[PDB]
């Protein structure tokens, strides 16, 4: 009837802290984000779940980046393209962009029509990126978020 | 198809100030409401279709307040509550919030799965209001949007 998503903001040198949670539930419509995130950057956020069900960063050039544990979108239907997340086209992975408000927290819910049951995004991570999302891989890829922010993973 | 919703921030003191238009299409999931919105009020604001085709004021108790010609939230299958765009008891003109960035621009669509055809919306009304949205009547009643910030007419 639920899962509840541990999120950490992300740090590879001195390390991850928690800065709260994500509940995902089953609507008629499809599944629904919640977040009581607290302690973020404001703004809208790049919001999709990835790959692989880890959150520990990979290294490049000496340079260690976050996340990249996590590899790619999840894209299980091989669309090979970013997107809306009301489009077949798009990975399977593609929220709607998340919002911090002005104190750092993170309460407005949305929704996934296209993913049905919890299980679905099980044995995957969650990523929030630091830039936001204009749904394509133009101008920029995967919408254009950029570092990897924060994280948690789906159990 | 598409339909192009002129939007006007209100001010029955000053005068209405044009603010951009919000685009609505048919996608495979529901309705998506597309803004490209200038000079609003940053933050998350409560995002409603409202009965009247109409964002004229109202005069109550020797002033004008802006939007009242709108009437209510639209609820053509008469739950009489307040809730979330993936709900069935929620009001049918319940949209997700609208995001407005520090710029006061608003840019990110969101989605009302509920909604299927162009034709369903027209002759109704857009409300964007000064509050954000709780989906509750709890604490406060419809969401918490009070006032009504902009608005365009459904055509
Ligand atoms: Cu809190
Ligand atoms: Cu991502
Ligand atoms: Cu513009
Ligand atoms: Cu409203
Ligand atoms: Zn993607
Ligand atoms: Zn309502």
Redesign the interface.
């Known amino acids: 009837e639920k899962l509840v998503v541990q999120v950490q903001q992300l740090d590879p040198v001195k390390g991850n802290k928690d800065v709260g949670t994500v509940e995902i539930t089953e609507?008629?419509?499809?599944l629904?984000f919640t977040p009581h995130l607290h302690g973020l950057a404001?703004?809208?956020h790049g919001f999709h779940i990835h790959q692989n069900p880890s959150c520990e960063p990979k290294e490049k050039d000496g340079k260690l980046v976050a996340g990249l544990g996590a590899g790619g979108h999840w894209d299980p239907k091989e669309t090979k393209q970013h997107g809306?997340?009301?489009?077949?086209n798009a990975h399977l992975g593609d929220l709607?962009?998340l919002?911090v408000?002005?104190d750092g927290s993170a309460t407005?819910?949305?929704?996934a029509?296209?993913l049905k049951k919890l299980d679905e995004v099980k044995g995957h991570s969650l990523m929030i990126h630091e830039g936001?999302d204009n749904?394509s891989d133009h101008p920029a890829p995967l919408g254009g978020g950029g570092p990897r922010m924060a994280c948690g993973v789906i159990k």
Chains 1, 2 share one sequence.
């Open positions: 609507s008629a419509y499809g629904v404001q703004g809208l809306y997340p009301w489009s077949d709607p962009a919002f408000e002005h407005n819910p949305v929704l029509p296209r936001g749904h």
